[PDB]
């Protein structure tokens, strides 16, 4: 009885695959054409329906090519996704938060009818790598209307994210030297309220740049999080609770959550 469910019933193998079950088309946004951000690429499922919309920001000196694989993969599970370039490659996290917001507004208002016709504008999510993940936290902390937030190896000088009320999955990299989990990802997760839906997934043997190439674990749990909270799709709770295995032979260095989720 959930009107937001899309696609067949999930399995571990389906979420680890390099494509979800939807064929995908693309629409480009030029730098000049984009107000408030540096342009981007919108990926959308071809199959006629409305879907949640996601904006993804790269990090410092990063371009949309650094998150492109992940944007396309998420879209192939039934989402409209824009991977953005930023106004300049040196923009700081709080600027990237404004550009994430601009990108969502662009998809809803100024993209073509192929895109707008496929977006449920009431179901929006944000993601970002590094300073883009910092921008994800900042925007989520200002925007309780957002349905989900996924900071990937996030970087931010502010360590206190107690005002976030959005369901938030933080992915860290254990060997991160650029945004060390000791002083970024872990304090961020610890400052999120315990009353919200949240999770911390620390990749094993991973550098800061693990999100920038195809990664089955990042893909699987990013999609499961978006399905669970953008679509309210309880078929995906099984992957999040109790979640990935936490050690020898396991998927991840560590996993924490507020399971069970409301
Ligand atoms: Ca622009």
CA distance 103 to 97: 10
Q: How far is the CA of 165 from the centre of ligand 1 (A)?
A: 30
Q: Which string of DSSP letters, residue by residue, matches the chain?
A: --TT--SSPP-HHHHHSSS-SS-EEEEEE-TTT-TTS--EEEEEESSSS-EEEEEEE--TT--GGGTHHHHHHHHTTT-EEEEE--SSTT--HHHHHHHHHHHHHHHHHTS-HHHHTTEEEEEEEEEEETHHHHHHHHHHHH-TT-SEEEEES---S----TT--S-EEEEEETT-SSS-TTTTHHHHHHHS-TTS-EEEEEETT--TTGGGS--HHHHHHHHHHHHHHHS--GGGHHHHSS-S--STT-S-SEEEE-PSP-
221 closest CA partner among 190, 256, 186 = 256
Q: Residue 139, exposed/middle/buried by CB under 10 A (0-12, 13-18, 19+)?
A: buried
Number of separate domains in the chain: 1
The residues pairing with 148 across neighbouring beta strands, listed in sequence order, are 125
Q: How far is the CA of 32 from the centre of ligand 1 (A)?
A: 5
Q: Residue 145 is part of a domain; what is its CATH number?
A: 3.40.50.1820
157 closest CA partner among 88, 60, 225, 66 = 60
Q: What is the resolution of this structure in A?
A: 1.9
Which residues carry a binding-site annotation? Answer: 60, 131, 155
Q: How far is the CA of 55 from the centre of ligand 1 (A)?
A: 15
Q: Which two tokens stand for residue 75?
A: 């879209």
Catalytic residue among 129, 156, 184, 208: 208
Q: How far is the CA of 30 from the centre of ligand 1 (A)?
A: 7
Vertex 260 angle, CA 256 and 262, to 5°: 120
Domain that holds residue 109: 1-262
124 closest CA partner among 26, 34, 230 = 230
Is residue 130 flagged as an active site residue?
Answer: yes
Q: How far is the CA of 83 from the centre of ligand 1 (A)?
A: 14
Which residues carry a binding-site annotation for poly(ethylene terephthalate)? Answer: 60, 131, 155
127 to 46, 58, 190, 232: CA distances (angstroms): 22, 9, 19, 18
Catalytic residue among 85, 176, 231, 233: 176
Taking the C-alpha atoms of 15, 19, 24 and 30 in order, what is their torsion angle to the nearest 10 degrees?
A: 90
Cβ-Cβ contacts under 8 Å for 55 (sequence gap 6 or more): 81, 82, 84, 100, 103, 104, 107, 124, 125, 126, 127
Strands ordered across the beta sheet of 198-203: 24-29, 40-45, 80-84, 51-57, 119-129, 148-152, 168-173, 198-203, 254-257
């Amino acid at each position: 009885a959930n009107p937001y469910e899309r696609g067949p019933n999930p399995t571990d193998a389906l979420l680890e695959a390099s494509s979800g079950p939807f064929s995908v088309s693309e629409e480009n946004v030029s730098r000049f054409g984009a107000d408030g951000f540096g342009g981007g690429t919108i990926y959308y499922p071809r199959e006629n329906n409305t879907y949640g919309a996601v904006a993804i920001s790269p990090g410092y000196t990063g371009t949309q090519a650094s998150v492109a694989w992940l944007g396309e993969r998420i879209a192939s599970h039934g989402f409209v996704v824009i991977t953005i370039d930023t106004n300049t490659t040196l923009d700081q996290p709080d600027s990237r938060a404004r550009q994430l917001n601009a990108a969502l507004d662009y998809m809803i208002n100024d993209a073509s009818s192929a895109v707008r016709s496929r977006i449920d504008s009431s179901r929006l999510a944000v993601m970002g790598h590094s300073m883009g993940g910092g921008g994800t936290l900042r925007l989520a902390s200002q925007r309780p209307d957002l349905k989900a937030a996924i900071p990937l190896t996030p970087w931010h000088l502010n360590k206190n994210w107690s005002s976030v009320r959005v369901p938030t999955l933080i992915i860290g990299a254990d060997l991160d030297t650029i945004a060390p989990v000791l002083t970024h990802a872990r304090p961020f997760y610890n400052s999120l309220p315990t009353s919200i839906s949240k999770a911390y997934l620390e990749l094993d043997g991973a550098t800061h740049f693990a999100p920038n190439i195809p990664n089955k674990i990042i893909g699987k749990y990013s999609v499961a999080w978006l399905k669970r909270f953008v679509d309210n799709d309880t078929r995906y709770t099984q992957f999040l609770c109790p979640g990935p295995r936490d050690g020898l032979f396991g998927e991840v260095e560590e996993y924490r959550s507020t399971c069970p989720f409301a």
